[PDB]
Design a protein around this ligand. Structure first.
Ligand code: DGI
Ligand code: DGI
Ligand code: CL
Ligand code: CL
Lengths: 302, 302
């Protein structure tokens, strides 16, 4: 019935999909093994989709933009899924589906495989600035979009530094009310910075667009740019290359996390960490000697 | 004579220091243990120094700037060490000392402890864009300086993206000949981008300076800014905080590298990696199943 579940999901059975996602989200070691066989079976039916990441600060307008984009897309014949890695008009529609960082990252990546196997051709993955969540989403999508504020000199308030460089497309949102002209200036400032950061880029220099997600303006143009991104990368053979690299990278991350977890989650290492850290912070112990004691203690109690 | 070596180094014996550095650089497992006791003994004599990282593309003018800065400093009573993580006027002077990423990072960090114990109060650490070398240097210094070109719209040619955000101070070098006016404009462009990236920074927004390292102009002003950096961070209690955090982070990196090495350097894992990677890249195997096989195989042959 792993085979049964896989037949149901790829056939479009709407009841099978949530159950597969639950199987996939199960931390229970016996479910992990079934989940893996199911994914192995569905892997060949996946990949036929554009995965788009969406980030920006609380209140910048991510969920408003996502609802609007999702309707834009549904009306053009797509089947759209929305996941979040920490929208009522959208969630009612039959062609939409709305649903540790290591743990949530893993469950989200596996869930994408199920959704694509189930016929979803657009996958929107939303995140906020929590820990390393932006990098995790950027590493599982084709196109990563950053929403910013439409204020000259203040577009990136509250964004973790380094996040700008993850973006394939940058959007100055809320380009309405008293800020039409200002949004254009704000966009031109970000474009100037992107030109500095990507001075001789030949394939894809991140465009900067304006949008009013609440007035439904610039959404279509945003999606037109997302499609151009895929077309440009596909013509260079880089769309498939990025995916293959992400998958290999993720494989090694899983290896890393498995071996590091043995140490990090050891209760006795947990008990003595503070004092070993205090001793390092105070110059009483070298980092190499603290590291050795951490490994010795893990080994003694594993 | 670990005790003997430690007494000689902290007493200023110029012959002891190179030998300690050689001990520290020894990959031989018996030397590592002596090295650790020596560092433990010298740790309390270290820290009385300003550690400055210097990066930028090949030919931007790093070694020219370093030689000039090092003489500037020697003439002001400092004892200056220069390390490189991949200058003849300087190397002749008695108050100067010129000398795997994980391995070189480790040896450089430990060497800083020896140098500081030996009376060096300025440590300049040079790197280029090789792998993750910039981040490694930024994580072992107090102040990280990025040199760029003095050309409008082309300052960051050849720099890995994300490196700009590591900088505490940015310098447009070669502000001479036909580019005096242009260097000022180039500096103003980078300043604009830094204002965008750090829109509401209250403690330290990276200044952008001009320099002609070959005409010895702007070096003094660069050092004045490096001192201001330390003064500002020290007044906020952040200079010591950054160091303590770097040391703790490095401790855990050593733990990580020790446990991951058991897998990464296993010959049998090395043999089968390509095919397991090929199978992942082709959608024949899930990343989680490839990861499990990697761990199983390491375990079988360790
Ligand atoms: N003026 C203006 N306001 C907007 C726009 N898009 C969203 N908003 C409003 C709706 C909410 O009151 C608030 C936050 O929106 P949201 O969509 O919940 O933001 P987010 O927290 O999901 O990023 O901003 C927009 O395009 N213009
Ligand atoms: N015009 C000009 N040329 C400079 C300046 N500083 C260094 N140079 C020259 C000296 C070398 O010919 C070349 C590269 O300098 P370098 O100091 O070896 O660069 P790097 O590879 O260590 O970064 O550039 C400078 O400030 N102005
Ligand atoms: Cl492609
Ligand atoms: Cl301090």
């Amino acid at each position: 019935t792993v085979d049964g579940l896989a037949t149901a999901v790829r056939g479009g059975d709407r009841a099978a999909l949530p159950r597969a996602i639950t199987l996939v989200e199960s931390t229970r070691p016996d479910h992990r093994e079934q989940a893996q066989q199911l994914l192995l079976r569905l892997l060949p039916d996946s990949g036929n989709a554009h995965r788009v990441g969406i980030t920006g600060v609380p209140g910048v307008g991510k969920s408003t933009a996502i609802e609007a984009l999702g309707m834009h897309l549904i009306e053009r014949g797509h089947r759209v899924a929305v996941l979040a890695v920490d929208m009522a008009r959208l969630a009612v529609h039959p062609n939409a589906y709305i649903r540790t960082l290591g743990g949530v990252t893993r469950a989200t990546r596996e869930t994408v495989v199920l959704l694509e196997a189930a016929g979803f051709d657009v996958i929107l993955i939303e995140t906020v600035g929590v820990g390393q969540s932006e990098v995790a989403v950027a590493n599982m999508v084709d196109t990563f979009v950053l929403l910013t504020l439409a204020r000259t000199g203040d577009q990136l308030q509250g964004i973790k530094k380094g996040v700008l460089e993850l973006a394939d497309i940058v959007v100055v949102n809320k380009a309405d009310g008293e800020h039409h002209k200002e949004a254009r200036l704000a966009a031109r400032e970000l474009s100037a910075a992107i030109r500095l950061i990507y001075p001789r880029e030949a394939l894809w220099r991140p465009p900067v667009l304006t949008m009013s997600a609440v007035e439904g303006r610039g959404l279509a143009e945003l999606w037109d740019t997302v499609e151009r991104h895929r077309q440009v990368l596909t013509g260079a053979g880089e769309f498939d290359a990025r995916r293959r690299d992400q998958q290999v990278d993720w494989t090694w991350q899983l290896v890393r996390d498995a071996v590091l977890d043995r140490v990090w989650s050891n209760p006795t290492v947990r008990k003595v960490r503070s004092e070993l850290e205090r001793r390092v912070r105070a110059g009483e112990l070298t980092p190499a000697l603290a590291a050795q004691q951490i490994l010795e203690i893990a080994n003694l109690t594993d």
